[PDB]
Design a protein around this ligand. Structure first.
Ligand code: HEM
Ligand code: LCY
Length: 154
């Protein structure tokens, strides 16, 4: 699958808004993930003690991680599909160390879409949401292929 340049521009135009405050967006996204699919929190030995949204919001460490996650994803999106170099270490760690199934990457993709839809109606209309879905699908497709190369079913 291949996104058009027009599609990449819709992706990067909403990402430009995320970048006004990546820390805020990362908190929203991880909290949405953990609330919508509580099982995902159990993968984080670092964070699985957090009991409530209030505790999550107050966690400086969770905020730090959200910035790390969105910055890595931002770097991937800015490659506009040319993300082989970026996907190698991410696939290896997430397959082998963290053991994150592809379904959980689907869950975080859903969280990203939900947060952008909520925060950014001006840059996340139907066409833009479709482009972001396509970008995130491409990301998961390529990650899943790497998972298989690495010996993880996903
Ligand atoms: C958009 C998809 C994701 C991106 C871009 C991303 C990015 C990252 C990055 C950059 C790191 C630090 C370096 C590394 O270990 O590779 C990391 C760590 C980690 N990721 Fe992800 N991640 C994603 C999805 C997920 C999901 C869905 C889960 C769990 C359901 C997860 C679980 C973890 C865990 C447990 C760590 C180690 C946290 C720690 O103890 O420091 N990741 N991730
Ligand atoms: C998706 C949901 C889950 O718990 N696993 C392990 C999946 O593959």
């Amino acid at each position: 699958m291949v996104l058009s340049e027009g599609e990449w521009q819709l992706v990067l135009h909403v990402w430009a808004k995320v970048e006004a405050d990546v820390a805020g967006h990362g908190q929203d996204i991880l909290i949405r993930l953990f609330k919508s699919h509580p099982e995902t929190l159990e993968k984080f030995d670092r964070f699985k003690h957090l009991k409530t949204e209030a505790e999550m919001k107050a966690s400086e460490d969770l905020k730090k991680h959200g910035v790390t996650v969105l910055t890595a994803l931002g770097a991937i999106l800015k490659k506009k599909g040319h993300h082989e170099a970026e996907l190698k270490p991410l696939a290896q760690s997430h397959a082998t160390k963290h053991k994150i199934p592809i379904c959980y990457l689907e869950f975080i993709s859903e969280a990203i879409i939900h947060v952008l839809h909520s925060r950014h109606p001006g840059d996340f209309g139907a066409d833009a949401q479709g482009a972001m879905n396509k970008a995130l699908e491409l990301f998961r497709k390529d990650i899943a292929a790497k998972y298989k190369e690495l010996g993880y079913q996903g």
